Paper text:
In this regard, we used a synthetic human VH library to isolate a panel of soluble sdAbs against human epidermal growth factor receptor-2 (HER2). We chose two sdAbs, Gr3 and Gr6, for further evaluation.
To our knowledge, Gr6 is the first sdAb derived from human VH with this characteristics and the solved crystal structure of Gr6 presented here is the first structure of human sdAb with a dimeric conformation. The monomer structure of Gr6 has the same fold as the canonical immunoglobulin variable domain, consisting of two β -sheets with five and four strands. The interactions between monomers are predominantly by hydrophobic contacts involving residues Val37, Leu45, Trp47, Ala50, Tyr58, Tyr91, Val93, Leu95, Pro96, Leu98, Ala101 and Trp103. No salt bridges and water molecules are found throughout the interface. Among those residues, Val37, Leu45, Trp47, Ala50, Trp103 are the hall mark residues situated at the VH-VL heterodimer interface of the immunologlobulin variable domain. The other four residues that contribute to the Gr6 dimerization, Leu95, Pro96, Leu98 and Ala101 positioned on CDR3 loop are unique to Gr6. This suggests that these residues play essential roles in Gr6 dimer formation and replacement of these residues in Gr3 (Leu95-Pro, Pro96-Glu, Leu98-Gln, Ala101-Arg) disrupts the inter-domain interaction. In this work, the Gr6 crystal structure shows that the VH-VH interface mimics the classical association of VH-VL dimer, strongly suggesting that Gr6 is a strict dimer and that the structure does represent the dimerization in solution.
Author numbering:
A (entry chain A): 4 to 128
B (entry chain B): 5 to 127
Amino acid sequence: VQLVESGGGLIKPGGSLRLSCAASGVRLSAYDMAWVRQAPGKGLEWVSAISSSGGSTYYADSVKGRFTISRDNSKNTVYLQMNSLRAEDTAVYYCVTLPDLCPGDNCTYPDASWGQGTMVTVSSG
Amino acid sequence: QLVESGGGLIKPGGSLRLSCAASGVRLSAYDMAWVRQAPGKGLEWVSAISSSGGSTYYADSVKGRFTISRDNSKNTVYLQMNSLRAEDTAVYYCVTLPDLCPGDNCTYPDASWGQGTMVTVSS
């Protein structure tokens, strides 16, 4: 399984960007997916997550209302729409799968994975 | 905040048991996991455990060598690492796994990430 994020870059405060993550080697539908970020000088922080079906989602309070996570399993891609960006949203964004838990070693789930990350810089002047 | 301990220096082939405790967060109510980042490498999943502790996950590189467990009476989570080698040297983070809301307005507490602790496999 391999995750590759794209859409990162430089944008002015107030802007909107859509990050995407394509999975290869395993159908994306097998995974509940999530976005994690790490701002300069800060620890890692959960941003958003979405179930394999797309019916359940998670959002950190810091981005609630401005960010929307979605997915297109047919394209094996997950997205993170980021609106009304702020300087504090500057960080490396990672797309990751969420572990599938098993009662004992009796499952045949595909392995979990982490993307390489993509930088998002919200600045001006 | 989540705080990891029990790391540090360990000789090759040795064992360490990492612990994670938290202040302002009730760990027993969350599925938990361990993530690591070796020098010059990207972050990667290590292991995970259900809130009840009945279900688990292990990355291929550590399965059979590591054991994740938890004590919900002390609200702590552990990761016993055995047969440690150079590739296991890394910063280890304990994290809660996000609660997914089937719609909007659920009342789950926010997810959190530990600060991480260094594990150095050296003689």
